[PDB]
Every structure is written in C-alpha cells, then in structure tokens.
Nucleic acid binder design. Sequence first.
RNA 1: GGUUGGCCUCGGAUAGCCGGUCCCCCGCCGGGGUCCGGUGCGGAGUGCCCUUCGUCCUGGGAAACGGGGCGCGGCCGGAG
RNA 2: ACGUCGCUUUUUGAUCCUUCGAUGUCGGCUCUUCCUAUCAUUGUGAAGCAGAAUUCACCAAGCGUUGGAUUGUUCACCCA
RNA 3: UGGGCCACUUUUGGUAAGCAGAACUGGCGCUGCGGGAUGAACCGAACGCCGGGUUAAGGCGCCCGAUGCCGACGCUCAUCAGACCCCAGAAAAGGUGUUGGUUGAUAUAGACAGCAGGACGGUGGCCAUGGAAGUCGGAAUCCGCUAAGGAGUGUGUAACAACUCACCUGCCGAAUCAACUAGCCCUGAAAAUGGAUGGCGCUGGAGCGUCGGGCCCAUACCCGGCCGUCGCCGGCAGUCGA
RNA 4: GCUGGGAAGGCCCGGCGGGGAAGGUGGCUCGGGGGCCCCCGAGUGUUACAGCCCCCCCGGCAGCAGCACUCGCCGAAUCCCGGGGCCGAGGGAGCGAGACCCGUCGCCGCGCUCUCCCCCCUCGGGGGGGCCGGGCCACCCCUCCCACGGCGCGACCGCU
Lengths: 190, 139, 201, 56, 175
Amino acid sequence: MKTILSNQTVDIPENVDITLKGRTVIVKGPRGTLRRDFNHINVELSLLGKKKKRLRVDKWWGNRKELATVRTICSHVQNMIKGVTLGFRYKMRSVYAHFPINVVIQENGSLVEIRNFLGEKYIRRVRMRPGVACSVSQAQKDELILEGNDIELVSNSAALIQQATTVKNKDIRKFLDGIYVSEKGTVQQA
Amino acid sequence: VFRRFVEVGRVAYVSFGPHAGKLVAIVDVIDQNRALVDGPCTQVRRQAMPFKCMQLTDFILKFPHSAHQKYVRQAWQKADINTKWAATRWAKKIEARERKAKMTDFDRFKVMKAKKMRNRIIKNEVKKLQKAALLKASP
Amino acid sequence: EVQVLVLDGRGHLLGRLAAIVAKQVLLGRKVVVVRCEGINISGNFYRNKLKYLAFLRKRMNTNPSRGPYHFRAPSRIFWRTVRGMLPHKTKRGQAALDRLKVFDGIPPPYDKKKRMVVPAALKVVRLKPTRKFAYLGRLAHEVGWKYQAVTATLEEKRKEKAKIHYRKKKQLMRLRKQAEKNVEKKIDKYTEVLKTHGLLV
Amino acid sequence: FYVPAEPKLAFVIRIRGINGVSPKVRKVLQLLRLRQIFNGTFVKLNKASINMLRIV
Amino acid sequence: KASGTLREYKVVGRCLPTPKCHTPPLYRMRIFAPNHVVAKSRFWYFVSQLKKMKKSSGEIVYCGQVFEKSPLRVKNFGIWLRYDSRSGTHNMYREYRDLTTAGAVTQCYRDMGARHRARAHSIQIMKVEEIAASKCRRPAVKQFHDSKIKFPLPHRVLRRQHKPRFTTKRPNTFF
RNA sequence: GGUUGGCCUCGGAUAGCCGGUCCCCCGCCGGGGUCCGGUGCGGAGUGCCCUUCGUCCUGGGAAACGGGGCGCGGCCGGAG
RNA sequence: ACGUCGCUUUUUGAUCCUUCGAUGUCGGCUCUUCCUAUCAUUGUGAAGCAGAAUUCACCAAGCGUUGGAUUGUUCACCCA
RNA sequence: UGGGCCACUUUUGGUAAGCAGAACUGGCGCUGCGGGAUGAACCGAACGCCGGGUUAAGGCGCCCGAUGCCGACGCUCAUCAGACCCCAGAAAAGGUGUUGGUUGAUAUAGACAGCAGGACGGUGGCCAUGGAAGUCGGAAUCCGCUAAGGAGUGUGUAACAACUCACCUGCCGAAUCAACUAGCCCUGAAAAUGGAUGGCGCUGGAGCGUCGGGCCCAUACCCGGCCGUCGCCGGCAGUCGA
RNA sequence: GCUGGGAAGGCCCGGCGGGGAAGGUGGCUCGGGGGCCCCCGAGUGUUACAGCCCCCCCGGCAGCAGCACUCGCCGAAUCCCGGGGCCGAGGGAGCGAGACCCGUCGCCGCGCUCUCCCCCCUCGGGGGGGCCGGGCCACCCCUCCCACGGCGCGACCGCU
Ligand SMILES: [Mg+2]
Ligand SMILES: [Mg+2]
Ligand SMILES: [Mg+2]
Ligand SMILES: [Mg+2]
Ligand SMILES: [Mg+2]
Ligand SMILES: [Mg+2]
Ligand SMILES: [Mg+2]
Ligand SMILES: [Mg+2]
Ligand SMILES: [Mg+2]
Ligand SMILES: [Mg+2]
Ligand SMILES: [Mg+2]
Ligand SMILES: [Mg+2]
Ligand SMILES: [Mg+2]
Ligand SMILES: [Mg+2]
Ligand SMILES: [Mg+2]
Ligand SMILES: [Mg+2]
Ligand SMILES: [Mg+2]
Ligand SMILES: [Mg+2]
C-alpha cells in the first residue's frame, strides 16, 4: 500500500533559527551552528511559521520503509535543535577491579590516552571526532565528560573510548574492566 | 516544494492519448493512477484518465467532487479558463510549435531571409557594444 | 549520422549505455564516450564489487598470461562491456569496435565540444530513487585502477576552465539581449515574420 | 425468452498440421476432407457430425 | 480462461424439458468473461457444480452483456471470491475502486495474479457488490474517501526516452 | 576509398531547477543575502548558426567606428 | 531417543552408455594445482568461559600439516 | 528385415537409475526445416527449383530479425537475486523483510506501549523434610478486605529475605492486539582447472504474476512462374479454305 | 442493422415534490492563523451563502454504439476512392465473308442510330430532358386468410 500523505511537524524554539537549502537543514542557535543534509531521503521540508517556527516533513506516496523515514528526519532535526541550544554531554565512568585506568587528556580535549587498562603496557590513543571535547570531571573520581553539539559525533567518540577499553581472551562477565557510558544528558540543564 | 497538486477542480493539459492537446478538469480521484475527468468546454466528455498523460496547469476551479457536468461547465465559463489558458506562456509555446510545424517551403524561405537580416543587425549592434565597452582606461 | 557522437558518461547506467553505443557503432557511427568514471551501475557497491572480484577470479589455470584480461580503468571496463554486446570475432564487429573511443575524464580533443546524453540510459529516469548504485570510478579504483586521484585533479582543473568559459558565454548572451532591445525599430519587421511562423515566441 | 434454433451449418478449418496425428483423429479429418492445414469445409450439423467434431 | 478487459454477462439457462417436469426452473448467473463464448462455457461450469445440469442436458435461453448502469460514477466494489493456492483453497474479500463492475473484476483478476500468483482458472468470483465508503474496510480504498483529497505527482519519469534518443539536455523530473 | 553544411565546452540537481538585478567581502571580477522573472525547460539540441544560381542597369533600407588577405611582422592563451 | 527431511560422490553396491583392428591395470617416489566439510595460525561470538586448559560456532583455504619401526600395501598400528 | 530406441499416459521388478520388463499412440531409426544458445526423440511443421504475401512454435535491450509502444496493474532487493515444456539442481523447517487474506479479541465505562504507585490478611495453607515459607515436588485451586492481587509468572536464597510477573490504579489521549494463512525475498544451501539465465549485462525492469496493441520469420499456408511424376486408359487420322 | 427496440450522458436553473444520507456546503462551536474584520484544522448535520444518491404524477428537445475518440457485435442490414510491392504464364479464339494488310474475337455488362421533338454550351461539335401504355409499392378507405407472441372468455380431458 502507498499512503497518500504522511507528515510530521517539529517546533523550533525562539532562540534558534532553521534555514532550508533543499533537503539541507542549517540549525543555528546560541551554542553554534549545525549542518545536515537529507538528500538520501525523498521528502519535502517546509518552514511554516514566522511566529512559532514550525518545520514540516511531508512524504507523498510512500510505502512502509520510506514512511519510516519521516520521524527519523524529525528526530534528527530535534537532536540538532537540542545540540545548538543545550548541547550534548556524555559521562563515562571507568570501572576496574585491580588496575586503575589512567586517562590523560591531550591537546584541547581532542585526544585521550588510556594507560593502565588491565595492567597492560600498551597505551591506547583515541582521537575524538571534530567538534567534540573530552575532559576529566572534578565532581567524580573515575569519570570522563564528553561535550559537543552533534549527538552523532559525541556518542561516536564515546563509543570509540568504550570499544578501545575492551578485554581480550577473558571471560567478560568476570573481567568487567573498561570505560562505559554512564549518563547521556545535556549541558546547561535547561 | 510542490506548487501544483491533483485536486478537485485542477485543470490539466492532456499531453498524449486520444484527447491530446486539450484541457480538462479533475472531478474525482480513483486508485492513485486515474482520475474522473471532464472537459465540458474543451470537448472531452466525462471519463477516467490516467495521471501519466496529464500535465497540471496553474488553474483551479471551484466545484464539489463528482458534481455534474452542468456545474463543472459553469465553473469553467465563470473565470473562463479558455481565454486565461490562451494567454499563458505555455499555450503560446504550443501555438508556436504548431505553426512552425505547418510552415511551408515558401514560408521557410521567407523566414530564412528575415532571420538572416535580423541576425546581421543584432550582431552588428553586439560588435558595437563590445567595442564601446572595450574603451576602459580607469584606475 | 556523419559526425562523431560524443557522449558524457556521468549519470549513465553501464549496460543501458553500452547497448545504445553498440548499436550505434554497428550502424557505422563513430562514438566517443568520455568520463567513464562517472558511469553508474545499479545495485549497491559491495554487490557490484563482488561481481568484479568474481570476474578477477576467472583466469586460465595453466597460464594466466593467456587467460582473460581484466582491465581496471573505467574506460576499459566500459569498452569491454560494449565488446560483449558486439560480435567482436568478425570483421564487421571489429570495425564496429574500432569506431568506439572511451576515455577517463575528458581529454583536450573533446573537452571543448558539446557532450550528448542518452536519456534511455540515464540513472535518474531508469532507476527508482530508493535504489542503490555504484560508481564505476570507485569500483575501478578499489579493484586496481591507479589514476583516480590524478583524473580527479585534472577534472577539477578542466571544470574551472569551463566555468570561466561559461561566464564569458553568459556575458555575451546578456550583451546580445541588450543589443536586441537596443536595435528594435529596425528589427521588429523581421521579428514579426519569425513570430508569425512560430520561431521566437 | 426467444431461444433461436440451433445452427444447422458449420464452417470447419483444420488448424494443426499433419505430423504425429493419432489414427482416429486422422480418420475423422479425412472424412471431413481436411487433409491439410488451413483447409476449410462446410459441415451440416447434427448429432452424427457434432460427435465427429468433438473427436477432432 | 484467459483475460483481456472483462465484460459482465447475464446468462440464463435451464434443463431441457423432459416427460418428468415439462417446465424446469430458469437459472440466472453473472459471468465475467472476455466474450459470450467464454461466458456460456463458464455458466455451464458453474451450474454443473451447483445443480445437476449439463451442456448436453440443458440449454441457454439468454446470454447478454450487462452494461454498467453508472459508468460515470466513482464507486467502491467489494468482491467475494474463492481461489486455489498451491496448497489449499481460500475465500477472499477484496475491495477496488472503479466506474464499472467489469473493470473492478478485471482489477481483481490482475491483482490476484500479481499478489498470489493465482490464474484465472483458479479464481472463482462469487459476489460483486457496490459498497458504501463507510462500509469499506481496506485502507488502500479508504484513503481515497476524502472530499478535499490533494496530492502532487512527485517524481515524473521521462517516458519519451527515445524521442530524442540523444540530446544535450538531461531531463527534468520536478514539474 | 569514404563522405555530400556547422555547433568553439558550465557545473550539476532531479521531493527541484535556470536567468537577471541592488547591498557585504575577494584585487576593477566573482561568492553570498535580499529582490525580480521563467519553469511541461523558449537564454529551448523538439534548439541555434550558415544558407550557394551568377552577373548587368538600378532605387530604398542595414551599414559605413565596414569586408577580403594560403601578405608580412609581433604578442597572448592552451600540456591530459 | 522415537521419528522425519536432505546433501556428497574421497566407500561399497546397482547398471552396462563409451572403449576388446588395446585408453598400459596396485602401491610408493617426484611435482603442481584445486576443494573445504578448518587440525593449526589471523580476527571474532558462546560456554556447565575465574586463570591456565578445553569445547561449540562464524568470516576464512593466505600459510603450514613432519622424522621413523613393521608391512608391497592403500589402510593400520606404535615411537618421537 | 527378424539387435531397436525414445516421449505422453497406464504399468511390473528395484532405494533408485540416462536400470530392466510390458500396454497404447506417435516419433527417431529412414528426416531435412523454424524454435528449445547447444542436442537422434521436445514444441511447430514435414521437403521438387524460385518470387510475393502470411503465419506456427518462439520471440522483439545489444550480440540478433522484431516493442525506439510516452503499453496497463501489482509484487520483489538478494554481502550465493531472478529469469520460460522436456532441461539440465534442491527438501523438511524457519523469518517482528514486505504484501495480501482468514478468524478471534481488547478499547472514550480510557485500549496497546511506555513512565509511575499498590501487588495484601487466614497463611511459613496439607503431605512430603535434613531446609524447603508462592516458586524441587503430590494432590487440592479456597475465603475476607478490597480498585486489585495467583494460597502464585519467573530470577534468586541452604531456607528466609530481596526483585519480578497477572492483577488493579495514575499519567498519557485513539485505535490496538493475537493466532493462522500464502505470494515474492532471505536462512536452511558444502567440492574439487576459471566460468556460465547462451553471453554482455539488466533493478521506474532486460526480474516475477496477470493482460493489450503492434512487429519479426520456417522448406508450413495462400497467389504466381518453371521442372518432373501421377491421373483424366483426356484430345488430335477432319491437312476437312469449304 | 441489432441490443434492455442499447447503457449512460447533454440541454430544458425540469418542474410539483417525497426520501436518504456523507468523502459535510453554508452556518454554529472549539483549536492554530493574516490589520473586533479576512484564512487553516477538528466536531454538529441535512440546504443553508455548494453539491451527491433514489422514487417520481410525468417528463420534453436534440443526438444516438456520436464528427465532444465512454463502453459492442455486425453488413443481401455495404458501397466509393486512393497508395506501395511482386507478377505478365499463355499465343491460329474467325461456322463467317467463301476469310486475303494484323481473327479489335467468345461469354458478360452497357451506349447510339435506322422516331420525333425540345433545352444548354460551342462553329459543324459537345452535353442533357425524353417520346406511350401497363403493373407493384408509397398515401387515403375497408378488407380476407395464415403464422408467431400476449391477454381474456368458455367446453372437453387429466391431475386434489
Ligand atoms: Mg525520541
Ligand atoms: Mg581462558
Ligand atoms: Mg508435434
Ligand atoms: Mg596405445
Ligand atoms: Mg595414453
Ligand atoms: Mg566454511
Ligand atoms: Mg526401457
Ligand atoms: Mg539401422
Ligand atoms: Mg516413415
Ligand atoms: Mg523429421
Ligand atoms: Mg533448430
Ligand atoms: Mg537450453
Ligand atoms: Mg517466402
Ligand atoms: Mg532470442
Ligand atoms: Mg534489432
Ligand atoms: Mg536461493
Ligand atoms: Mg457510427
Ligand atoms: Mg506471353
């Protein structure tokens, strides 16, 4: 079955403005700007409000699989709005039984050095995605903070660290050491 | 992004098929491939028509769906689509194509002579403009 | 026809374009296909790369030097596709194959000429927008072509020169429109004839 | 309802060739004088002729 | 049975009068067939299943094409049918939109072939009724019950791909 | 032995395009942002250009800052 | 387990289509290549995976898979 | 001549066999031709030497004649896709891939899903016992307060404890759930030289199913020419310009 | 030509109406919009500031498988004209003059003259109307038989 019309609307806050260039969305807010094109999805995007700033995604004559993309686009745009207004902050706790995992943060927070993971002498060097800043928290002991605007990049960097600290040739239900994402929140808490 | 829609009252130009070259109005929609179609002032009786042979125009009439041909014709004559259509750039491009197709040998000869003179004058003026614009002595 | 038919390979599907080109060169026409790295193949890239790797596997077990020759340039890949549709083991088919020239990028003979397009072979009309496709340039580069980078740089250089040429052409057309509105009293007599006979709406 | 009389005349055309024909079909076709493909003949319709047409 | 565009036939038949019952009952059927020859054949096929009748022991007293009463009115058709699959026999209810009953039945034959690989000899139409929009059940049909229906034609495919076969300009899709 | 006018070029998009114009930055031209048009492409390859009977009297228009030089000499661009 | 569905042609049968104006019939030695239904090695997933060891499974045939006593042996068995 | 063989269907022995043996008709043998890429037997059609027309079976992206139709409707994405009688490779069993269909159930007296509260008392019910308390087991399967709660769905303890369900309730505001069924696709699906829808390739189809209009060509059919054979036991002795 | 003596449809605002509703017009209510005035979305439902369907008490006009290309089967109920391609086999056809320069011949279909008037172009030629009586059908009157179909009225027979 081909549904005649499937549309979804997202609301844009006052402090953030959205510009459309075809299927390329530019979301500019107080924390910076974000670009993302959706040329891989055949939808129409329209800006409706001069007062309340609604963005509408319409898909005409779509089947099941391509009606599944309307809310995907809407959620991506909402994540863009969230990133440019509040930002994204992923906390990572480093857990270990015996050997403390020593994480040092190199230039501007874009490079992470894991030293003593499970007592190994190999030094893990993980480079964050551009626009992502890593730091060692002051409130908690074994905690890293990854902050950025693009949720894609922030969570990809968190996954890079988590998969860098991976146990080999051992029962992973017993050897639980590693750095794991503990919380996925925002910055500015608003 | 879309500016023209299939809707009740939308006037469509039939591009091919038995009724090619005519205007119709969409009266109803069936099964996403066809429409009930009625051109009462363009000599197209009511019938089903695939959307593939339609090219939507910019005119939209106002009548309810599956209204009778009397009301479709009244809506067509009020705000007469025939004259409005003839005035559009689309219709006169069609007209130019038709009268170029029916050009005779003598008309082709006369067109060749007129085009010859027109192009020579235009290119002389073009050369004049280029030479005039080439006098640039400025900091 | 009697002139050389130059086709731009960008955005065209491999087999569709090859069938059209093969019939043209069998009809005695000289065909030049440029930008063979812009040719597309339907189906996703991994699938098409697997097809080419299976082609690479077919070699003469006794002497691979005698075995099938796997050409890695996109132009040679397209040329071999056309040869598959020609009767290349006859003199007629070999003459047809000789009437075909294929290039990666657009060399200086044909970069100053207008390039044709075959709509019946174009990806935009022939392939559903929701379907995946592979680039012949990428596929060739990953099966062993060595000149993807240099062809890209030369193509961007050519595109810069073409942009300059287009700006000049637009300037000339603006000047022609200004001239047309300038000499109008002495032109409306012939303009009327053209409008009467359907040229010049 | 007016039911018209069952037709009394038929035109019969042999549409298949002469290769690999079973003996009964062959005999009936010879009796109908259709010994060639695209040979036609008129047949007066009754029970006897209709049951011959059913064979072929 | 093959196809084409189907037509509806009212076929009326009966058993031959015998010295047991002089006036046998008359039976009427709706047959969707390419032509009246096929219509008579299908009538005998169905009445042989229903009653104990045969072509030899009976006669067809009428066979006439039933013209659509409202071929200018869009309507919804519900079709009850039964068909043989590869592993069983099933009853189906299907819905179509058309201007003619025979056109909707043709749609049904095309659709059964497309979705179930069912051939016309397997399909067996047993009821066709013009239903109301409020009585429709299939969402594909029901999505056209919109008084203010409106949709564009998004991705227009170039169909004259060979007139011209070679051209400078790449085609436009948005219209 | 063929052949029986030429086309001297944007990049591309396709749920989008093309053209033009006023303000800002790039050393006088482009890139943006407005704004204005066109879009079954008409600034259109279904298109455009050239268009060949030749001369002689002989007027009006176009031009007259014009045409033709296998005439010389110089310069510039083009390397896939 | 009781059942049931397959695949393979490295077993042995079944058949007798080719060869009886002849296709040299076992094994070993030598040498190349191929297959994967993977023994090891690379990368992984699972466990009745604490570690070590082992077992099951996936991508996978790139590389390797040995020296000997007895026996014509193929097989077999043992030493290392 | 007295070696037969093959195919539809019937049919015996055998696990089966391109095995062995029967019945019926046709064929190959003895037979070319169009189609099945290829092929003794399949499909069409049987043949003197030619011209024109038209077909069969089969086809019409290119090889390669013909769809260069503005063909119709759907289905289908395959990191081993599929692609036409015989025929040249697959099964049981699976899939929350998608598409149709059947039957049933819940819901504005508030469904479903989520987040959020309660999930009691007799009673640690009886018999089993080393400990079995709702949860190793054997029967029973009740009652009260209730909005509701099994003398218990599962995790867990030696046993408790502690979680969790089915059961009710808050928020949320409109449709939702389940079991089947069968199309295409996927898993099942492993062999040896490198290789086969015939190849190239094809994914708004050059795939699959149902249909249309055109069009292509056989030694077949029709018209005509010419050769020969057979038949008319055909005509002519009337050369009878009288 | 036939059909359901086509089905639909067009026009006559179809008129007196009756009824049904919904893919719900106006209006009303609610919720989001453009400078208390103009839109979009959701509810009420029966004409309103649109329309649709059915029955009519009855329709009328034109057209008529339409030259407004919606959907057939046909031709004793069928004729005219045109275009492309391939072909030209045969060779004594005279019953008549008694053939004589080569049978422009048979069957078939026609025209004119051996009758006389007219009419129209043309300078004798060309083109037209015919030229008297019969039937048969068309129109009016009333008139017989038969066939087929329907309806009614009996009389007989059979069957509750
Ligand atoms: Mg969310
Ligand atoms: Mg271990
Ligand atoms: Mg046969
Ligand atoms: Mg020898
Ligand atoms: Mg030898
Ligand atoms: Mg394996
Ligand atoms: Mg046998
Ligand atoms: Mg023999
Ligand atoms: Mg014989
Ligand atoms: Mg034969
Ligand atoms: Mg053959
Ligand atoms: Mg085959
Ligand atoms: Mg022939
Ligand atoms: Mg073929
Ligand atoms: Mg061809
Ligand atoms: Mg498979
Ligand atoms: Mg007619
Ligand atoms: Mg002759």
